[PDB]
Structure formats: structure tokens, C-alpha cells
Amino acid sequence: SANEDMPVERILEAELAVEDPVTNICQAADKQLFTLVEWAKRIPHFSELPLDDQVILLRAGWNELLIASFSHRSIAVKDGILLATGLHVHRNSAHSAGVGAIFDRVLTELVSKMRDMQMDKTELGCLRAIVLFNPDSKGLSNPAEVEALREKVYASLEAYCKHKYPEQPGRFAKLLLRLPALRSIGLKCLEHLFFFKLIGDTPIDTFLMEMLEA
Amino acid sequence: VQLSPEQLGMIEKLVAAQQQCNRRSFSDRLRVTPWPIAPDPQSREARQQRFAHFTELAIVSVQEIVDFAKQLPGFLQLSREDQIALLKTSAIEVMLLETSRRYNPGSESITFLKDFSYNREDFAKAGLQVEFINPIFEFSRAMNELQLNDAEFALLIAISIFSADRPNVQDQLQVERLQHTYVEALHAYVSINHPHDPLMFPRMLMKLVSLRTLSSVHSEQVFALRLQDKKLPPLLSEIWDV
Numbered sequence: 001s002a003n004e005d006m007p008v009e010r011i012l013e014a015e016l017a018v019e020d021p022v023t024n025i026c027q028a029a030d031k032q033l034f035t036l037v038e039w040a041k042r043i044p045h046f047s048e049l050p051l052d053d054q055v056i057l058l059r060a061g062w063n064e065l066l067i068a069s070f071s072h073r074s075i076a077v078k079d080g081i082l083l084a085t086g087l088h089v090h091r092n093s094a095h096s097a098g099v100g101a102i103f104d105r106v107l108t109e110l111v112s113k114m115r116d117m118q119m120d121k122t123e124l125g126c127l128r129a130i131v132l133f134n135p136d137s138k139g140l141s142n143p144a145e146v147e148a149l150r151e152k153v154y155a156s157l158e159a160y161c162k163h164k165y166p167e168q169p170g171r172f173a174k175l176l177l178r179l180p181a182l183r184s185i186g187l188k189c190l191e192h193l194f195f196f197k198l199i200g201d202t203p204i205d206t207f208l209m210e211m212l213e214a
Numbered sequence: 215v216q217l218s219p220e221q222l223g224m225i226e227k228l229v230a231a232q233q234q235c236n237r238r239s240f241s242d243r244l245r246v247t248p249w250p251i252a253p254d255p256q257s258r259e260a261r262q263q264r265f266a267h268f269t270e271l272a273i274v275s276v277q278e279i280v281d282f283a284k285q286l287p288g289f290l291q292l293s294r295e296d297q298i299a300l301l302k303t304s305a306i307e308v309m310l311l312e313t314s315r316r317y318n319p320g321s322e323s324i325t326f327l328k329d330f331s332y333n334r335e336d337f338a339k340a341g342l343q344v345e346f347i348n349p350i351f352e353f354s355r356a357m358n359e360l361q362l363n364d365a366e367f368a369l370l371i372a373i374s375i376f377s378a379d380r381p382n383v384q385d386q387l388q389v390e391r392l393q394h395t396y397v398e399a400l401h402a403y404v405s406i407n408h409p410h411d412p413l414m415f416p417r418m419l420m421k422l423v424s425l426r427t428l429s430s431v432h433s434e435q436v437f438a439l440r441l442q443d444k445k446l447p448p449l450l451s452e453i454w455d456v
């Protein structure tokens with residue numbers, strides 16, 4: 001039945017129901033963090049899991065989820081992002097604040113990629129829903145069910161892709177391949193100012209530069 | 215689409231390369247501090263021996279990885295600085311991938327290069343920390359569940375290596391489209407090779423996501439060294455520390 005187990009229409013609705021630099025961005029997240037409970041309850045079968053696992057899932061992925069959302073909403077702006085507070089944060093402003101690298105990553109690996117393959121909101125909602133149904137989050141009563149729902153989002157999302165964009169044989173793939181880049185950008189954002197900042201020493205890749213040659 | 219002739223050859227060439235790179239490396243074990251069979255749970259000679267053993271296999275690994283990289287069409291055509299970028303950051307993932315392949319259910323152990331099954335304790339006995347070992351063995355049990363095959367691990371490795379978002383990559387569009395080629399191939403091969411199981415593909419591309427996490431945990435384990443007074447040998451120190 002596919003889409004019947006993960007109504008992409010229900011998800012689309014969840015996604016539509018909840019709509020200095022570092023501090024603006026921080027409050028924006030603060031604001032949007034009040035919605036995740038709502039956006040998650042609408043997602044199919046989510047509220048059906050053990051109350052405790054719902055919390056774990058939400059606790060584990062809130063930052064990837066929020067990042068994805070503002071990256072997409074930013075499809076509109078140029079070299080910037082649009083906060084859930086109504087503020088435009090420009091690329092430079094982020095550089096002057098000292099968070100240029102991670103900021104540029106979110107533009108090229110997220111905003112931009114999303115702008116190209118013209119990612120729609122149903123698709124976004126499914127990636128979000130895949131990020132939500134993360135079975136590896138520790139503490140989970142039963143990873144197995146969380147995994148099962150995630151797979152159900154797999155099927156559904158693909159069916160959807162082959163239907164709305166049948167002339168794009170690899171749509172489903174281009175979407176999933178966004179998740180790795182999002183996961184890295186995520187684990188970065190969660191880093192201690194020291195690991196986060198601590199600018200390295202312009203490495204000299206001699207041993208490897210060698211090996212490729214030998 | 216179905217497996218185009220162009221594809222089937224690529225895959226066959228790839229599985230050809232692994233066997234090759236894994237052959238010219240099979241010689242290097244005659245240059246690897248043997249695993250010490252000492253009773254003292256934690257001496258200082260034993261701790262160093264075991265740590266040398268693991269760090270060395272890590273070295274042979276980097277080389278087996280650099281050889282393979284040269285065998286993937288398109289790799290040797292990028293900036294030398296890009297080839298460095300893709301390998302520098304990819305190394306860890308390919309290692310974890312090549313570990314899961316050698317994962318043994320029942321034994322709950324990982325047998326590196328032709329023999330000697332290492333388990334969680336051994337891993338510990340070698341310097342690694344529990345917060346990295348567990349995730350490792352977990353990713354293992356899982357990849358193992360997928361009952362993948364030689365070609366399937368190859369394609370994955372290749373997809374891992376051709377990640378356009380690795381830091382310091384310049385020709386990002388080339389790397390991207392280059393990756394697409396193996397994704398697409400892996401898709402076809404999977405559909406055919408694994409019919410009645412359409413999820414194999416998604417399940418696969420997802421491990422690519424698990425690798426990013428295992429990557430940052432491992433880098434949490436490299437720093438941990440700065441407080442242990444154990445040193446990484448030149449090669450590893452270059453691809454990680456920096």
C-alpha cells in the first residue's frame with residue numbers, strides 16, 4: 001500500500017503547520033523549538049510510539065530538523081538565510097561573527113543544493129521524518145519500531161518521487177544524499193566553542209601527497 | 215534502469231581493484247609488530263605492543279585505501295589537492311566499512327587481514343576507548359545484517375570516497391556527478407541482485423550517514439590521545455591531527 005502507511009499528505013501538513021548573528025540565529029532556534037512537538041505528533045505513527053521514545057527521538061534530532069527547515073526556507077534569499085523570527089542573516093555578518101565556515105557549509109550543502117533540484121516541501125518533510133525516526137538514538141525502548149517507521153518513510157518518499165518527478169530516475173537518491181552532509185553540519189553545531197573554533201595549523205599533506213605519486 | 219554494460223564493467227573493475235590492493239598489502243604483515251600474547255592485563259610493553267599493532271594495520275589500511283582510490287575511474291583526474299581532501303577525510307569511513315565486512319557474528323569479533331579475531335576487549339587492550347569501540351561493533355553487527363557482497367562493499371566505499379562536501383574540496387561538481395555514477399550503479403545492481411528487497415538501496419545510502427557520526431566520535435578519540443601520552447605514527451598523525 002506504500003504511501004498508505006506514511007501518508008505523504010499528512011507529513012506535508014506537519015511541515016506546513018509549523019511555519020549579533022549567532023544570537024539572532026540562537027533565538028530563532030529557541031522560537032522554533034516550541035513547535036517540534038506539534039510537527040512531530042502530526043507525522044504518521046509518531047505519537048504511536050512509547051511516550052519515552054518520542055522524547056528521545058525529539059531530543060536527538062531537534063538540531064538537524066531545525067537546520068533543515070531554515071535551510072529550505074532560505075531557498076529564497078541570496079548568500080544568506082531567513083530566520084523563523086523574520087531576520088535576514090547575511091554571509092558576511094556570519095563571517096564577522098567568526099562562524100563563516102560552518103555558515104558557508106550550510107549554504108552550499110543545503111540551501112544551494114535544495115535550490116537546484118528544486119526540492120519541494122513534501123520531500124523536506126520526509127527527510128525531516130527520516131531524521132526523526134533515528135533508531136540509533138540511545139535509550140530507545142525498541143530501535144526496531146523506530147527503524148520500521150523510517151523504512152516506511154523510505155518507501156513512501158520514493159513512491160512519491162517516482163510519481164511527481166518520473167523523469168528524474170534518481171530523485172530519491174539525491175534527497176537521501178543530503179542527509180550525510182546535514183549530519184556532519186549538525187555534529188559541528190553541537191561542538192564546544194573550543195573544538196568548534198580551535199582553528200588548525202594549515203596542514204602540509206606531504207606523506208599523502210607523496211603516496212598518491214609513488 | 216537496468217545494469218548497463220558500461221556499469222557492470224565498472225563494478226567488475228572495482229571488485230577487481232579491491233582484490234589487487236588487498237593483495238599487494240597482504241605482503242605487508244611481514245612488517246607488522248605481532249599481537250603480543252601476554253598475561254599482564256595492562257603492563258606498559260604490552261600496551262605499547264598492541265597499540266603498535268593496531269596503529270600499523272591502520273597504516274597498511276591507508277595504503278590499501280590509496281591504491282583503491284587510484285583504481286576508481288575519475289579519481290586520478292582531479293587536483294592533487296582534491297585527491298588529498300577526499301582521502302584525508304574519507305579514510306576513517308572506509309576503515310569502518312572494511313571493518314564491518316570482516317565482522318564475525320557469533321564470535322562478535324573482527325578479523326583483520328587474513329587472521330586473528332579481535333573483539334571489544336582486544337580493541338580496548340589496544341588503546342581505543344569504549345565510547346568508540348561500542349559504536350564500532352554496533353555499526354558492524356548492522357552492516358553485517360545487510361549481508362552485502364564484495365561488489366556491494368566496493369560501490370559503497372567508492373561512494374564514500376567521492377563525497378563532494380568533504381572539507382577543502384575544490385571541484386565539487388566533478389566529485390558530485392562522479393559519485394552519482396556509483397550511486398546509480400549501486401541502485402541498478404541492488405535492484406537486480408536483491409529483488410523483492412527494494413529497501414536494500416535506501417538502507418545502504420543511510421550507512422553513509424552513520425559514517426559521519428562515527429567520524430566525529432573517532433575524532434573525539436584522537437583528541438583523547440593528547441591526554442594519554444601515546445603517539446600516532448607520522449602517517450596517521452598527518453591524516454588526522456591535521
Ligand SMILES: COc1ccc(NC2=C(c3ccccc3)C(=O)N(Cc3ccccc3)C2=O)cc1
Nearest residue numbers: 268269271272275309310312313326340341342
Ligand atoms: C580495517 O583495517 C584497520 C584495522 C585497524 C585499524 N586501527 C585503528 C583504528 C580504527 C579501528 C577500527 C575502525 C576504524 C579505525 C583507529 O582509530 N586507530 C587509531 C587509534 C588507536 C588507539 C587509540 C586511539 C586512536 C587505529 O590505530 C585501522 C584499520
Ligand SMILES: CC1=C(/C=C/C(C)=C\C=C\C(C)=C\C(=O)O)C(C)(C)CCC1
Nearest residue numbers: 028029032063066067070083084099189
Ligand atoms: C546554523 C548555525 C548554528 C546552529 C543552529 C541550530 C542548531 C539551529 C537553528 C535553527 C533555526 C535558525 C531555526 C529557524 O529559524 O527556523 C550555530 C549556532 C552553531 C552557529 C551559526 C550557524
